Every structure is written in C-alpha cells, then in structure tokens.
Design a protein around this ligand. Structure first.
Ligand SMILES: CCCCCCCCCO[C@@H]1O[C@H](CO)[C@@H](O)[C@H](O)[C@H]1O
Ligand SMILES: CCCCCCCCCO[C@@H]1O[C@H](CO)[C@@H](O)[C@H](O)[C@H]1O
Ligand SMILES: CCCCCCCCCO[C@@H]1O[C@H](CO)[C@@H](O)[C@H](O)[C@H]1O
Ligand SMILES: CCCCCCCCCO[C@@H]1O[C@H](CO)[C@@H](O)[C@H](O)[C@H]1O
Ligand SMILES: CCCCCCCCCO[C@@H]1O[C@H](CO)[C@@H](O)[C@H](O)[C@H]1O
Ligand SMILES: CCCCCCCCCO[C@@H]1O[C@H](CO)[C@@H](O)[C@H](O)[C@H]1O
Ligand SMILES: CCCCCCCCCO[C@@H]1O[C@H](CO)[C@@H](O)[C@H](O)[C@H]1O
Ligand SMILES: CCCCCCCCCO[C@@H]1O[C@H](CO)[C@@H](O)[C@H](O)[C@H]1O
Ligand SMILES: CCCCCCCCCO[C@@H]1O[C@H](CO)[C@@H](O)[C@H](O)[C@H]1O
Ligand SMILES: CCCCCCCCCC[N+](C)(C)[O-]
Ligand SMILES: CCCCCCCCCC[N+](C)(C)[O-]
Ligand SMILES: CCCCCCCCCC[N+](C)(C)[O-]
Ligand SMILES: CCCCCCCCCC[N+](C)(C)[O-]
Ligand SMILES: CCCCCCCCCC[N+](C)(C)[O-]
Ligand SMILES: CCCCCCCCCC[N+](C)(C)[O-]
Lengths: 189, 189, 189
C-alpha cells in the first residue's frame, strides 16, 4: 500500500477516537440505542465500532493515494481543521436529531459542502461518495439485524438517519485529505 | 441587462429551490404559519414565495454587475460555499427560533459576517444592505396584511424576526457573488 | 507598551461589548445566574464584568506583541471574522448549555480549533492557552465566593462549564490577532 504502517496506525487511532466521541454523543442524547449486550463495550460503543470507523479512516486515506494527483501542498493545519469540522458536525447531529428531518439534513449537507469547498478536490469528493454509500448501507444492515436502532424521529432512511449521507461524505473528504497529508509530511530534501 | 437570460433563469431556479427548503423548515418548526388558503402551494409555500426569492436572487446578481469592478476571479467552489452558508444559516434559524432574541440574532449576525469575510467585497456588502432592508420590509407588509405570521417568540421586528436582517444581508452578499460568477465562468480564449 | 493608548481603548471597548452580549445570552438562557445584588449592573452583567473582559482583550493583544514575529499581513477582514467566530461560539454555548457535557464541549472545541486553523499562529495559540487557564480559574474562584453560579447541567469543571476552556482559548487567539492588526494598520509609506 501507499501508506506506511505507522501512518495507517495513526489514522486508525484518529478515526477510532473521533468515532467514540461522536458515538457517545449519539447514545447519551438518545439519537441511537445499542441492543448487543454480549460484546465488550469501549465507553458507550461496542468494541468493534471504533475498529470499523478507524479501519475506514485508514482505508479511505489509502484509496485517495491510488486516485489521480494527490496534493503535495496539504498541511497539518488543514487536516486539523477538517477533523474539527467532521467532529463538530458529528456532535451537532446528536444535538439536533429530534428536530424535523428536512432542516436537520439540510444543515448537515451545508456543513459537508462547506468542508469540501474549503478542503476537498475531485478525488476527495469521490472518496466522500464511496463512504456516503457504504457507511449508511452497513448501518442499515446492522439495524436490520437488530444490533442497534435510531430514535424514531431520526430513522427515515431505511431505519437510519438521512443525515448519515452528508456526514459520511464529509468524513470521506477529510480521510482523503489525511492520506495526502501522510505522504506530504514525509521528510524532504 | 448584464446577465444573459439563461444565467438569470439558473439563478432564479437556485434561489427558488433554496427558498422552498428554508421556508419549509420555518413552517414545519412553527417559526412561521401561513394564512392564505386561496392560493396554490408549492411544498409548504404559496407559489409566489419561491418566485419572489428567485426573482430577488437574479435581481441582486444583476445589480452587482452594475456596481464597480465585478471580480473575475470568482469560482464555482466559492459560489457553492456561499449557497451552503446561506442555506445552513436559513435552516438554523428554524432550529433556534424559540430561543431568546439576543443570542439567536447574534448567532445569525455572526454567520453573516463570516460569510462576508470569506466571500464578500464592498459592492457585495452594498447588495447585502439593499436586501437587508427590502426583504424585512416586504415581510412586515405581508404580515400586516395577514398573509402569514411569525411565532410570538420570533416577531420582535415589527411583527417579523430580527434575524431576517442578517439572513437577508448574507443572501445579498452571495447573490452578488453569483452574478460575478455568471460572467466569470463564460468561455475564455 | 507596544499598543498605543487609543488602540488599547478600542480593544477594551470591543471586548466589553462582546462580553455583554455573550453574558446577557448566558443569563437569559439560564446558563448562569448572578448573586451579587449590591453592585451596579450594566445590562445583565455586574459593571466589573465587561471591565474584566475588556481588560483581558487589550492585555492579550499586548502580550502577543511581546511574542516572536507579529504578523504584518493581518487585515480588518480577518479580525472581523475572528470576532464573529468568538461571538458566535459564545452565544451558541448559551443555546446548547442544557445538553450533555461531551457533545457540547466537543462542539466548542471544534469551533476553537477551526478558528485557530483559519486565523491563528503559534504565538496566538500560546495566548489562547494563557487565557484558557486564567479565564476558568478566575471564574472558579468567583463561583467559590458565591458571586455567581452555573446551571447544574453546565458546572462540571469545579463549578464552571467545561466549554470555557476552548471558548477562552479561541478568545485568546483572536485577541492576539487584534494586537497584530493594531500595529499592522498603522499608517505606512
Ligand atoms: C496523519 C498524520 C500521520 C502521522 C504519521 C506519523 C508516522 O509517519 C512517519 O513519521 C515520521 C516522523 O515524522 C517520519 O520520519 C516518517 O517518514 C513518516 O512515515
Ligand atoms: C463481531 O462480534 C459480534 O458482534 C455482534 C454485534 O455486537 C454480536 O451480535 C456477536 O455476538 C459478536 O460475535
Ligand atoms: C469547515 C472546514 C474548515 C476547516 C478549516 C480550514 C483549514 C484552515 C487553514 O486552511 C489554509 O489556510 C491558509 C491561510 O489562509 C491558506 O494558505 C491555505 O491555502 C488554506 O488551505
Ligand atoms: C450561477 C451559474 C450560472 C450558470 C449559467 C449557465 C448558462 O450560462 C451559459 O453557460 C454556457 C455553458 O457553460 C456558456 O456557453 C454561456 O456562455 C453561458 O452564458
Ligand atoms: C399574488 O396572488 C395573491 O396572493 C395573495 C397572498 O397569497 C392572495 O391573498 C390573493 O388572493 C392572490 O391573488
Ligand atoms: C461561511 C462561508 C464559507 C464558504 C466557503 C468558502 C469557499 C471555499 C473556497 O474558497 C476559496 O478556497 C481556495 C483555497 O484556499 C482559495 O484559493 C480561494 O481564494 C478561496 O476563496
Ligand atoms: C483593532 C482596531 C484598532 C483601531 C485603533 C484606532 C486608533 O489607532 C490609531 O488609528 C489612527 C487612524 O487610523 C492612526 O492614525 C494611528 O496611527 C493609530 O494608532
Ligand atoms: C469589585 O466590587 C466588588 O464586587 C463584588 C462582586 O460583585 C461585590 O461582592 C463587592 O461588594 C464589590 O465591592
Ligand atoms: C471560524 C473563523 C472564520 C473567520 C473568517 C476568516 C477571515 C476571512 C478572510 O480571511 C482571509 O481571506 C482572504 C481571501 O481568501 C485571504 O487572502 C486571506 O489569506 C484570509 O486570511
Ligand atoms: C474521522 C472522524 C470519524 C468519522 C465518523 C464518520 C461517521 C460515523 C457515524 C456512525 N453512525 C452515526 O453510527
Ligand atoms: C456502525 C457501522 C459504521 C460503519 C462505518 C463504515 C464502515 C465501512 C467498512 C470499511 N472497511
Ligand atoms: C439563495 C438562497 C435563498 C435566499 C433566502 C433569503 C431569506 C428568505 C427568508 C424568507 N422569510 C424567512 O420568510
Ligand atoms: C415572503 C416575502 C419574501 C420577500 C423577499 C424579498 C423580495 C424582494 C423583491 C425583489 N424583487
Ligand atoms: C472578544 C470577545 C469577548 C471574549 C469573551 C471570552 C469568554 C468570556 C466568558 C465569560 N463567562 C462565560 O462568564
Ligand atoms: C467572570 C470572570 C471573567 C474573567 C475573564 C478573564 C479575566 C482575566 C483577568 C486579566 N486581567
């Protein structure tokens, strides 16, 4: 792969920590509820949850590095801003999940579009699209299996929240940026 | 006019779609209520509402092109970001309309100032001022006529919401940017 | 000092006005309650409150000018954006203070990180750290003395809100920027 093992591990850990914060926010606000008592939990989440999101973070970053022209001008400052934007949007969905679906979903779409406008390129958007489809699909399957459920006022997309689509999209854009950063920050002459 | 018909139509449609999303958000949250049963509705709005906002969008864009030095460096990326900022702010007012007037209005003013800081110039601000006056004035007249009303906790500006002033201001700044974009994106040598 | 008296006064007034707006927002939403009837109030605040924040604004700006390489490229546009970001974040804490501590605090941390990413440098962050410690410390002492109290759902940091840490941090970053602006905007050849 294009990522070095150490970079992949850092990205995995970054995704896992952000996932735990966001997922705890969803649980504590009643946005979601788990129904899987048999597995070990880490904070408010089944142990496999931060593993899934962490793995997706490293995978989307790797994917970007296989797409045309990774940007060499990416900085830690841009990456911090992107992570903050995704974390901020994630926790905001926990705060507003009980409100009507259109304004809630529109707000998250606006946040995602602005994140792309500031940080994203074409291949980054493509990564955003990939996870905007796979992310909600995995969740829909999990909900179907009874692993967890969304609050009844946040389950309009086949049992999951419509805001997942732009939330995952923004995640993909930023993970792609993190992959570009991993390469760009390597030692130079 | 400086805009070509096709550009004016695209801007009109853009404004109309964004207006319908925002106005549906206000209606579904109880920010506003219509009292005009005799006219055809489009989604949650009287059919003339998206026409008014769409027309204002094309008109403010046209106005900018009659003001000094339209910027030739404007991009679709900046325009998407501006539309997202205005849509995001519009739907946020629906979410927070029941809160006390000062923090709500201050939040919208902050959003509008940041939108200008990132995207606006002097003439863009002037367009923002024009609609920040005309917009609320039209609404105040409509409310006076009994066409619709604001929620009692959001009607402190002669029967309409004080947040309309910075919301319209930000709309004007972005419409002006869209006018500049319309010209800048034309085919070049 | 590096600031001229007139610049220090403008910064003091700017901080005082923003403090009064934010503090009124906290009082009117029940985020905080004062228990000091013997002193003259200005709007919703004890008269010494805007003096404290105004003084901190001028002091942090002055401090930045004693740290390495004040940036000469700072503009009024950047400064307006920074003030808007801090005011917007301040009033948002009033709106969301009743929600669970983790998502609320994470949202404010995200806002602060983005503010730094867009506007801050190393010395600006250092100023942010200074007030992120001193600010909450002063508040903790004041609460201990019974001068005011936080809402029971917003008092987890020794009697004050955990969101104060990133809120003050962002304040420090922007005050530092205002100090740089004060010097940069002086008449040039
Ligand atoms: C997203 C941030 C990723 C951080 C990855 C940290 C590990 O990467 C390695 O960091 C070393 C120290 O800088 C370099 O010597 C090396 O070449 C690089 O491969
Ligand atoms: C991966 O582990 C599995 O996770 C499921 C969901 O938590 C459990 O239903 C199951 O028992 C457990 O094996
Ligand atoms: C909602 C997402 C917001 C994330 C914050 C964006 C990162 C902030 C820093 O960005 C960078 O700032 C520099 C100074 O202007 C520019 O030189 C550079 O080109 C730009 O990329
Ligand atoms: C705001 C976005 C506005 C989009 C306007 C689309 C119509 O405009 C036209 O688009 C053609 C195709 O690009 C150009 O050939 C032509 O010169 C231009 O007038
Ligand atoms: C423009 O149309 C008018 O709109 C008004 C407001 O909806 C109606 O009161 C009126 O009947 C109708 O003619
Ligand atoms: C709250 C409103 C936020 C809207 C989002 C702003 C548009 C994002 C892209 O902007 C543009 O990004 C480029 C990369 O830095 C710069 O080269 C350019 O000069 C700048 O204009
Ligand atoms: C933060 C904004 C600070 C505004 C400070 C205004 C006072 O400063 C003074 O403004 C004069 C007029 O521009 C200059 O002639 C002078 O040299 C400068 O010292
Ligand atoms: C500074 O003034 C002091 O402020 C305190 C807090 O408001 C009062 O307790 C005290 O009486 C008053 O002297
Ligand atoms: C959440 C905090 C957001 C505050 C808003 C940031 C200030 C907006 C203007 O910034 C400036 O815009 C210019 C145009 O791109 C750049 O030339 C310049 O380098 C950049 O610094
Ligand atoms: C890098 C930040 C982590 C990305 C999080 C992506 C969204 C996960 C949403 C999980 N779902 C709400 O349960
Ligand atoms: C709660 C489920 C969250 C799933 C997030 C997306 C995982 C995709 C798997 C990528 N490997
Ligand atoms: C381009 C986006 C559309 C601009 C909307 C401007 C504000 C309209 C507010 C209508 N009012 C709240 O009923
Ligand atoms: C509900 C009324 C909204 C009015 C928006 C501003 C229209 C101004 C008319 C411009 N022509
Ligand atoms: C320049 C804007 C003013 C900075 C405000 C800094 C935070 C003060 C918080 C006061 N505390 C919540 O009571
Ligand atoms: C309500 C107390 C707010 C205190 C804000 C920080 C003041 C630090 C004093 C700097 N001199």
């Amino acid at each position: 792969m294009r990522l070095r093992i150490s970079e992949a591990v850092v990205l995995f850990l970054l995704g896992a920590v952000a996932a735990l914060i966001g997922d705890h926010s969803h649980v504590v606000t009643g946005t979601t509820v788990y129904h899987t008592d048999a597995v070990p939990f880490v904070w408010s989440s089944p142990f496999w949850f931060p593993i899934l999101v962490g793995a997706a973070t490293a995978s989307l970053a790797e994917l970007r590095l296989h797409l045309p022209a990774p940007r060499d001008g990416v900085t830690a400052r841009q990456a911090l801003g992107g992570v903050a934007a995704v974390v901020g949007t994630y926790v905001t969905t926990a705060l507003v999940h009980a409100f009507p679906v259109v304004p809630v979903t529109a707000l998250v779409c606006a946040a995602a579009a602005i994140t792309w406008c500031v940080l994203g390129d074409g291949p980054g958007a493509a990564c955003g699209v990939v996870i905007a489809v796979i992310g909600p699909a995995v969740e829909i399957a999990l909900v179907q299996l009874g692993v967890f459920a969304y609050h009844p006022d946040s389950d309009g997309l086949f049992g999951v929240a419509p805001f997942l689509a732009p939330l995952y999209f923004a995640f993909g854009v930023v993970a792609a940026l993190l992959g570009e950063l991993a390469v760009a920050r390597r030692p130079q002459l």
